[PDB]
Amino acid sequence: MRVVVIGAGVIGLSTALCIHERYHSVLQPLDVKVYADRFTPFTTTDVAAGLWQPYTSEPSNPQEANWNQQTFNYLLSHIGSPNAANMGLTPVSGYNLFREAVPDPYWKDMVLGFRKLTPRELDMFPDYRYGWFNTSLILEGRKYLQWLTERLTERGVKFFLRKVESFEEVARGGADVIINCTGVWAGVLQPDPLLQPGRGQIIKVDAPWLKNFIITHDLERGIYNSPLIIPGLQAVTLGGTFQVGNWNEINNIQDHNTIWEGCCRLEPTLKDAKIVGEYTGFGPVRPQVRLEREQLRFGSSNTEVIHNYGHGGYGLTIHWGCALEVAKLFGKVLEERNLL
Amino acid sequence: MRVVVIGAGVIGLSTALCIHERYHSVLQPLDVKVYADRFTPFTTTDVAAGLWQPYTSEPSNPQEANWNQQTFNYLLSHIGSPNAANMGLTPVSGYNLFREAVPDPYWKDMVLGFRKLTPRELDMFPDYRYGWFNTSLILEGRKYLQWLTERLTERGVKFFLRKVESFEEVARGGADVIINCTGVWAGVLQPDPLLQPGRGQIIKVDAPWLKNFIITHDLERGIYNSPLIIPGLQAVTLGGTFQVGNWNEINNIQDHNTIWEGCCRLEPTLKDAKIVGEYTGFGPVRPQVRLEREQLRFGSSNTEVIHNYGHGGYGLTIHWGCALEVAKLFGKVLEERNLLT
Ligand SMILES: Cc1cc2nc3c(=O)[nH]c(=O)nc-3n(C[C@H](O)[C@H](O)[C@H](O)COP(=O)(O)OP(=O)(O)OC[C@H]3O[C@@H](n4cnc5c(N)ncnc54)[C@H](O)[C@@H]3O)c2cc1C
Ligand SMILES: Cc1cc2nc3c(=O)[nH]c(=O)nc-3n(C[C@H](O)[C@H](O)[C@H](O)COP(=O)(O)OP(=O)(O)OC[C@H]3O[C@@H](n4cnc5c(N)ncnc54)[C@H](O)[C@@H]3O)c2cc1C
Ligand SMILES: C[C@@H](N)CCc1ccccc1
Ligand SMILES: C[C@@H](N)CCc1ccccc1
Structure with missing residues (x-):
């Protein structure tokens, strides 16, 4: 065989x-x-x-x-x-943010400690009105x-x-x-x-003070086309574009800006974070x-x-x-x- | 004035x-x-x-x-x-671990998202069978x-x-x-x-994969005399001694060991972590x-x-x-x- x-x-x-x-x-x-x-x-x-x-x-x-x-x-x-x-592999806790109420996800019981965010938590994120907390894993x-x-x-x-x-x-x-x-x-x-290819671009950054994932959603723009922050093992991933049909393997100036100002407004401490690399990959959509x-x-x-x-x-x-x-x-x- | x-x-x-x-x-x-x-x-x-x-x-x-x-x-x-x-200052989440059930702390509503630990969370930490999760802040x-x-x-x-x-x-x-x-x-x-002085010894360690604080308690040995792990902004703090009455400024070997292997047992990935410093300080008890x-x-x-x-x-x-x-x-x-005024 x-x-x-x-x-x-x-x-x-x-x-x-x-x-x-x-x-x-x-x-x-x-x-x-x-x-x-x-x-x-x-x-x-x-x-x-x-x-x-x-x-x-x-x-x-x-x-x-x-x-x-x-x-x-x-x-x-x-x-x-x-x-x-x-x-x-390591465990991380973090946030999912929305501009309005949304139903619970099918995976709410698969993760750890899923709940809706309290009004007090929400004041950490001025631009959003509803969200989730849970513990998941980095891989x-x-x-x-x-x-x-x-x-x-x-x-x-x-x-x-x-x-x-x-x-x-x-x-x-x-x-x-x-x-x-x-x-x-x-x-x-x-x-x-x-x-189809799902073109995604990311900025990797040295910002080790960030211990939580922060994922925002924009219902009128499609998934991962909204700022997202994911602390990795040694660096932090900054994202916010995911466009289907685009076969361009090279980094682009606009997506760089969309990721950087979207994430800098989410997490303004990003001002002192050193850029480590910037990449583009294609999800198999x-x-x-x-x-x-x-x-x-x-x-x-x-x-x-x-x-x-x-x-x-x-x-x-x-x-x-x-x-x-x-x-x-x-x-x-x-x-x-x-x-x- | x-x-x-x-x-x-x-x-x-x-x-x-x-x-x-x-x-x-x-x-x-x-x-x-x-x-x-x-x-x-x-x-x-x-x-x-x-x-x-x-x-x-x-x-x-x-x-x-x-x-x-x-x-x-x-x-x-x-x-x-x-x-x-x-x-x-940055937010962090983490765990407080106990070998037996304990009453809720008076500060449970001051922190964020305080709850008890579920059996599945308890499987991450074998030696322990009751605890809390919450979000707090690093300072x-x-x-x-x-x-x-x-x-x-x-x-x-x-x-x-x-x-x-x-x-x-x-x-x-x-x-x-x-x-x-x-x-x-x-x-x-x-x-x-x-x-009185509260002698505390710590080992600082490079282990940036650890995103959560992990604090164990031993109801009988008194507070912070049980392994603890706290990720800082750039490094991670390992502890487990807090000894009242003791004025010795020098690091000792047996507290080093208590801490290191206490913490390696809690968080076994610590085997790969580089030691960056060990220190001793006196809390004003x-x-x-x-x-x-x-x-x-x-x-x-x-x-x-x-x-x-x-x-x-x-x-x-x-x-x-x-x-x-x-x-x-x-x-x-x-x-x-x-x-x-
Ligand atoms: C920016 C970005 C962020 C993402 N973040 C996450 C995340 O946080 N969590 C998550 O779960 N998923 C995430 N994804 C999706 C995830 O990356 C993909 O689903 C996954 O990597 C695809 O795995 P794969 O092995 O199928 O493809 P790939 O990782 O692309 O592997 C393809 C392999 O096939 C080989 N190959 C192809 N054709 C041939 C050929 N003709 N001959 C020989 N070899 C060939 C290639 O060389 C390569 O080795 C992300 C995607 C992107 C773009
Ligand atoms: C290992 C360890 C870990 C700890 N972890 C935590 C924690 O995670 N969270 C927490 O909340 N607390 C923690 N603590 C407790 C915390 O460190 C102390 O409560 C706090 O640092 C006390 O601050 P202080 O300003 O009172 O004293 P110190 O930080 O000791 O400052 C004292 C100042 O007084 C000065 N001074 C004293 N005498 C004189 C004099 N005669 N003339 C001039 N100057 C003088 C000194 O030079 C110094 O400037 C920890 C303690 C230890 C030992
Ligand atoms: C949260 C992850 N499961 C997807 C992250 C992602 C996917 C595609 C582009 C950017 C980011
Ligand atoms: C969670 C923190 N309050 C650690 C305090 C502390 C005090 C003395 C020795 C070690 C740690």
Whole structure:
């Protein structure tokens, strides 16, 4: 059984680890390899704000809510462990701010200590009238990617920096199963018109006095198109743009200003914060996560492909539940081949 | 009106600023000076973990509860301001942990979002089975001392290196009023056997991933004799000793160990944290804060002294209320000389 995972972002590596941890002990031989054209720190995952929080509306697919919950429980469970921080993981509390009353989110009971903000808390944020408090987790993309690659490597999973031109090529080269974790670029290997890029730009800043996340919403502009502040492990992420359809990989002057003055008015102490870097990444926006089997016919055999892409602006939030589901589908593939 | 404040720790500079802001306008010529033999970063204040939280038990002087609350509201009112962090101030959330159920603290409604901990929160901290969550404020001693000294300076308040040897000496040199903010050493200038040193040792550590304060309690060993973790503005403070009666200024090995491994057990990610410094300071422990007027006679003239010392392990938590009370007592000194507000 030769399995090639394509993609070395959170989705690819989490899935690779999940498959391997689950089947190494019971299937000889199992050969899992990762192929990608960019590894940390050059993936969208590396640019992620680094916080666990789903969108404010339910998902179309009710499986996604579960995947989000499994991910939180998976991540929470690590708190107490000596290596939580070396995985990119720590607990944070913070605020969600609104210009008007809004319904509770479906995830209110998944986080810790969810409640509405009292009138007294609201005076800390003059521009907003209603909000939430809760405790969630930081999950730093960059650090988590380094952790997962060390955990994969020690288990004998090999990485190959290479650009896949088609599913065909990889199958022809000896893959029995392909796990497709190519993120926003999946369309290059199989056209998918529902998949769009969600261009997000961020400013990273040294401001270690900030201990809380602060996320504002503007209902008339779409999600994450409103200032947001997320303290990371060593730096702070400043955001406020997320526009679908825009394929420009370069930083832009307007979004820089939108992020900087939006965040400087939210958190005026930002005046003394040193800019550390400024980045742009593309969320794999899709009305729903594509996570499914597909049978491909080349040469003399079927090669099974399992897709796992289209996680929009919530891939870190939802990744573990998605990896588990892919390992399930793999298991079905195995019994069909009378392998276990 | 020549006022000498003795002390440049949080209590001293607080009170100085507060008097000055209240009475500069209505009283020329007001001349406020600060005398001290230790300034930042060599004051007890500089060593303070930097968190707002009173003791778990209510104080013998209930006035201290209001002084804590005035302080919190005062500090809170600055959140939203561009300069909150330059003052040493930022909000933080965190946990108070107990091995058994305990009554709610009197300060539960002064903080933000106080509630009990749920079983799931308790799974983060194995050794413990009851506790609180809340939001409070960091007030870094070292930074707040610097902020206050810039504010005082630009108001024309002048600072002098001086080890005062008696109230007499200062009254002889021309002071009409003396504000005594000498912390744990007040007994040198007037014996006060209720005042004892509360030796506290800490390890400062580079661990910027830790965003929450974590304070454990051991109902039997007395307060702050249990591991505690408090993220500061740039570094993290680790503690766990608070020993009354002990005057040894040097760091010792067995308290280092008590702290380090007590805290490594609580927060095991601390294995990767670089040690940046370890320090020892003496909290001015007293059954209650001394904050009162006293008239002393030296030759022909009366000298007015207002004492403000004995703030134990809660001086930052309570300081603004105390400064405001000293300013009230100053007002009454004024009105006794038929001067007006
Ligand atoms: C600014 C910003 C902030 C965000 N913040 C958060 C957050 O705080 N929390 C959260 O949960 N989510 C966040 N997201 C969303 C999250 O970043 C994404 O959902 C996630 O990173 C996507 O993971 P992925 O592994 O699917 O894609 P990627 O991380 O892009 O990985 C794609 C991989 O596929 C490889 N690849 C693709 N095509 C090929 C090919 N043809 N041949 C070889 N290799 C190929 C690439 O080299 C790369 O290794 C954010 C997104 C942005 C843009
Ligand atoms: C390890 C530790 C951690 C702590 N953490 C916290 C915390 O998180 N929150 C909190 O609220 N409290 C905390 N405390 C308590 C807090 O540090 C004190 O309550 C506070 O610093 C007392 O301030 P002060 O100005 O009264 O005294 P100090 O800061 O000691 O200042 C005293 C001043 O008096 C001067 N002085 C004294 N005698 C003379 C003299 N004869 N002539 C001239 N000058 C003189 C000194 O030079 C100095 O300027 C902590 C204490 C310790 C030991
Ligand atoms: C709060 C996070 N779950 C999303 C943050 C984000 C996503 C896309 C662009 C900027 C920020
Ligand atoms: C939460 C703060 N009030 C810490 C106080 C303190 C006092 C003495 C020793 C260590 C810490």
